[PDB]
Ligand binder design. Structure first.
Ligand code: B12
Ligand SMILES: C[C@H]1O[C@@H](n2cnc3c(N)ncnc32)[C@H](O)[C@H]1O
Ligand SMILES: *Cc1c(COP(=O)(O)O)cnc(C)c1O
Lengths: 109, 727
């Protein structure tokens, strides 16, 4: 079977074969890079928070409430932040606070 | 601070203050080539800068105790479940030339949906948290300043918590990591969508930290029914991960393929792996190779594993390998013990040094058969690509079971692991980003609207909050412990004691494990159980037979065993008693000449004994330049003493084998008297030997020394240069 499927490559130079290889690669993954550019996940958002200076604990509080609010799309660290500037407090406070129900109504507006 | 090459590693002191700790270095480090290097009496072609402190291979004692270091970075795996005992093993590993510590995670940490805190006891791996990464990354910082050469700390950024660990790794200076979107899908059944979006963020973080990135393709050989057929799948997987990491933003010099020589002997292993290795190197020019040793086709024999690793090591030499991960020769037998980790490191050092300069002498016949198979592999890799594409890209092919298929592609048996694109762990946790989505952090891959706040910050989103934790280590929250039972401090207490009592161990402190090896003249099933009994009667606890080798179905069976020794011992009770090298001996007879008369005396015809400690073959005393006037056998004791003065000799060496009626002790007493009488007893060493001579009994006859069963020139020459000095 393999003897026939290999027919149309038989002519390619060893380096044209190589060229073909890597562009099919790039062609297979770009759609994946795209999914990546325009979506988010729970783990990604935890890591934004971790970066903003929260613990792994606090961070899975914000993110786990942010999903229950359909607010994911805005980014859990964008909530923390606009809630921070709105009631004009610190990032670690607006965040600390969001971990237990505080300021979610305000958020949703 | 500190670390004296003779003071044990202070684990308790290291864990002290894991909150104030920040890493000296960052990112990956290679070995520095030391072109045309002179070590001992030799010139090295493919060597790296030497260590400033180390343990040379045992055979180096004959060479000035030189320890050449190879060019590839050498890797040692290290995890037991307790990262504390594992720090001691790392210091060990370093001195033996390893400069890459890879740390496996407790089974399935990949499924953990978040970091975990503190330092639990883990299961077939170390659990990865911040306390533990700071402890190990802090210890390596001493160990490294000790051996005098940087060491790369390395681990795993996998499963549903990708971006967290990665982030944690960057905060805390981990030097490299495994990361492959597909390990996640194919092997851990994690939703392929969730997963491929995790890896974008992950890799971006890791590019930011200049980290080395190793992929997951080796895991293919693990699942292959017949590894030598999984080659097309391998190149493909390697390629997706390479190209993926490349477009996220990593450097080709920071992207490594994880390649393993497919098969192992009785397989014609070289002849099956060399084309794949060569094709792989062709196709991925400019990328790094991390060569891993085989672990699939591997059994219970440390020897059998060790030999296969040398062949694996050869492939790397005939091709390329920027990293060379070793495998513990005991991997197929049990959890890696301290010693076998050192074995692997010394082996790779030994083999790579051994074949230093090899590619100046040997080349591949890149045409002929080699060059043809190479083509066949490339064409199959390419065909496989197109099959993937002509089914609608990656997500589809996986659903349609193209992966972990047990056939040689094209051939497809229809038994690959097939994943649901809607299924797996964390299915339905992908959320569409919004036009107003935002992240005030560094190293964020996806689409990020910082513009709705300030244009000037698009490229520096972290300015929005005056630095995230990548700029500002002080914003990192350090959780110490969450459990107050399962923790490192609790585990220190369990063995507080041993820190003047002493016992054997293999992995954890004071676990009293020892290896026991025997041979039993009976069948395999029986000798297994026989050896358990022997094992118990030696007071061994928790005995397990960890390897049966048949010699002959009937003649006998070799058996290895581990067992726990249920007791300690004390240093302070030990009865420990406080010699001239072949060269001093030679340098002495060199400057002051030594003339000897030697004879088998009496009516004795047994000549071989004395020829033996005389003849150069078995290190007799001709070897050291002693001048020996052999008189022959049956020489009358008078005739010997006569010759001694005739030839102005310095020593009489008489032999005496027949020992019936104490004739051997008498013949000596008569040599001493013939000597005293003739006024030369004081200026002549009289030495005697024979099967039935007891040194001390002979000294009471009046001869300066006796020699018995199993003496050698070294003893005789030593006695001759020592005794001579006295006078
Ligand atoms: C082969 C042999 C012979 C050969 C020897 C050939 C030859 N050219 O040497 C011949 C010669 C065939 C022989 C003859 C006899 N031997 Co025979 N011989 C043996 C045998 C088997 C060899 C031992 C031997 O060679 N040792 C190997 C050498 C390398 O080891 P070694 O002698 O112990 O020497 C070591 C140490 O002694 C030390 N050493 C020895 N001398 C000196 C000196 C100095 C200065 C130093 C530093 C060290 C040193 O270094 C050596 C180790 O590297 C032994 C049996 C035995 N297993 O011991 C008897 C044996 C010693 N001989 C024995 C007998 C009885 C005889 C005979 C009398 C019997 C007969 N055939 O009629 C005859 C008579 C010999 C005679 N005419 O003097 C008996 C011992 C009798 C006794 N208790 O006194 C033995 C023990 C055999 C036996 N059980 O009956 N036999
Ligand atoms: C069973 C396990 O859960 C973790 N874990 C997570 N949160 C806590 C907590 N608040 N208290 C104790 N352990 C916790 C551990 O560290 C672990 O070993
Ligand atoms: C090593 C060796 C021997 C050893 O035997 P001896 O009888 O003790 O000498 C003999 N012949 C050769 C050629 C050897 O190389």
């Amino acid at each position: 079977d393999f003897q026939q499927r290999r027919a149309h490559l038989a002519n390619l130079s060893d380096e044209e074969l190589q060229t073909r290889f890597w562009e099919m690669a790039e062609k297979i993954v770009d759609p994946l890079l795209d999914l990546g550019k325009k979506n988010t996940t729970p783990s990604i958002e935890r890591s934004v928070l971790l970066r903003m200076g929260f613990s792994s604990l606090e961070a899975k509080a914000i993110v786990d409430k942010t999903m229950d609010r359909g607010l994911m799309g805005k980014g859990a660290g964008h909530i923390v932040y606009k809630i921070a500037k709105e009631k004009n407090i610190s990032v670690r406070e607006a965040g600390l606070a969001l971990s237990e129900g505080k300021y979610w109504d305000d958020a949703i507006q | 601070l500190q670390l004296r090459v003779n003071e044990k590693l202070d684990v308790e002191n290291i864990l002290k203050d894991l909150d104030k700790y920040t890493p000296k270095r960052r990112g990956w480090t290679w070995r520095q080539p030391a072109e045309n290097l002179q070590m001992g009496p030799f010139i090295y072609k493919d060597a790296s800068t030497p260590l400033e402190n180390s343990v040379a291979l045992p055979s180096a004692k004959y060479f000035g105790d030189i320890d050449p270091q190879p060019l590839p970075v050498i890797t040692t795996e290290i995890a037991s479940g307790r990262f504390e005992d594992d720090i001691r093993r790392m210091r060990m590993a370093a001195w033996h030339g390893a400069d890459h510590i890879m740390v496996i995670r407790t089974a399935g940490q990949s499924h953990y949906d978040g970091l975990i805190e503190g330092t639990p006891q883990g299961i077939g791996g170390v659990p990865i948290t911040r306390k533990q990464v700071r402890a190990q990354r802090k210890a390596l910082d001493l160990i490294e300043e000790e051996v005098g050469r940087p060491i790369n700390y390395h681990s795993y950024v996998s499963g549903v918590a990708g971006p967290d660990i990665a982030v944690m790794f960057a905060e805390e200076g981990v030097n490299g990591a495994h990361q492959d979107p597909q390990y996640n899908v194919l092997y851990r059944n994690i939703n392929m969508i969730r997963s491929f979006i995790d890896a974008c963020e992950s890799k971006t973080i890791m590019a930011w930290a200049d980290m080395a990135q190793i992929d997951g393709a080796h895991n293919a050989n693990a699942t292959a029914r017949e590894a030598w057929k999984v080659m097309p799948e391998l190149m493909v997987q390697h390629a997706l991960n390479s190209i993926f990491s490349l477009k996220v933003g990593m450097k080709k010099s920071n992207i490594c393929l994880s390649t393993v020589p497919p098969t192992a002997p009785p397989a014609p292993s070289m002849y099956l792996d060399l084309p794949y290795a060569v094709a792989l190197r062709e196709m991925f020019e400019g990328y790094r190779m991390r060569a891993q040793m085989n672990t699939k086709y591997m059994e219970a024999s440390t020897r059998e594993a060790t030999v296969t690793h040398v062949l694996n090591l050869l492939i790397s030499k005939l091709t390329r390998a920027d990293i060379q991960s070793t495998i513990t020769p005991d991997e197929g037998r049990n959890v890696p013990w301290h010693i076998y980790n050192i074995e692997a490191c010394d082996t790779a050092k030994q083999a790579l040094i051994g074949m230093d300069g090899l590619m100046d002498m040997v080349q591949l016949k890149r045409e002929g058969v080699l060059g043809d198979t190479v083509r066949e592999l490339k064409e199959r890799a390419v065909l496989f690509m197109e099959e993937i594409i002509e089914a609608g890209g990656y997500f589809n092919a996986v659903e349609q079971g193209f992966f972990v298929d047990s056939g040689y592609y094209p051939e497809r048996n229809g038994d690959g692991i097939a994943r649901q694109i809607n299924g797996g762990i964390g299915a339905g946790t992908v959320f569409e980003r919004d036009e107003d989505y935002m992240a005030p952090v560094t190293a964020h891959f996806g689409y990020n609207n910082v513009k709705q706040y300030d244009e000037a910050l698009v490229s520096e989103p972290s300015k929005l909050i005056d630095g995230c934790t990548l700029e500002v280590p002080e914003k990192i929250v350090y959780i110490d412990e969450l459990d107050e039972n399962d923790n490192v401090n609790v585990r220190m207490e369990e063995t507080k004691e041993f820190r003047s009592m002493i016992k054997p161990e293999v992995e954890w402190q004071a676990d009293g494990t020892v290896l026991l090896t025997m041979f039993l003249p009976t069948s395999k099933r029986v000798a297994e159980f026989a050896a358990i009994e022997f094992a118990k009667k030696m007071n061994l606890e928790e005995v397990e037979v960890i390897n049966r080798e048949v010699m002959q179905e009937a003649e006998g069976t070799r058996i290895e065993l581990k067992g726990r020794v249920p007791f300690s011992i004390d240093i302070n009770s030990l009865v420990i008693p406080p010699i001239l090298s072949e060269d001093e001996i030679r340098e002495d007879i060199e400057k002051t000449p030594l003339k000897i008369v030697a004879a088998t005396v009496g009516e004795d015809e047994h000549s071989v004994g004395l020829r033996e400690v005389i003849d150069i073959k078995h290190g007799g005393i001709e070897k050291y330049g002693v001048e020996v006037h052999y008189l022959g056998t049956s020489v009358p004791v008078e005739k010997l003493v006569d010759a001694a003065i005739e030839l102005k000799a310095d020593a009489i060496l008489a032999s005496t084998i027949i020992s019936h009626d104490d004739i051997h002790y008498k013949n000596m007493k008569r040599i001493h008297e013939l000597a005293v009488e003739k006024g030369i007893r004081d200026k002549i060493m009289i030495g005697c030997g024979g099967t039935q001579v007891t040194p001390e009994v002979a000294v009471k006859q009046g001869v300066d020394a006796g020699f018995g069963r199993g003496s050698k020139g070294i003893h005789v020459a030593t006695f001759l240069v020592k005794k001579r000095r006295e006078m």
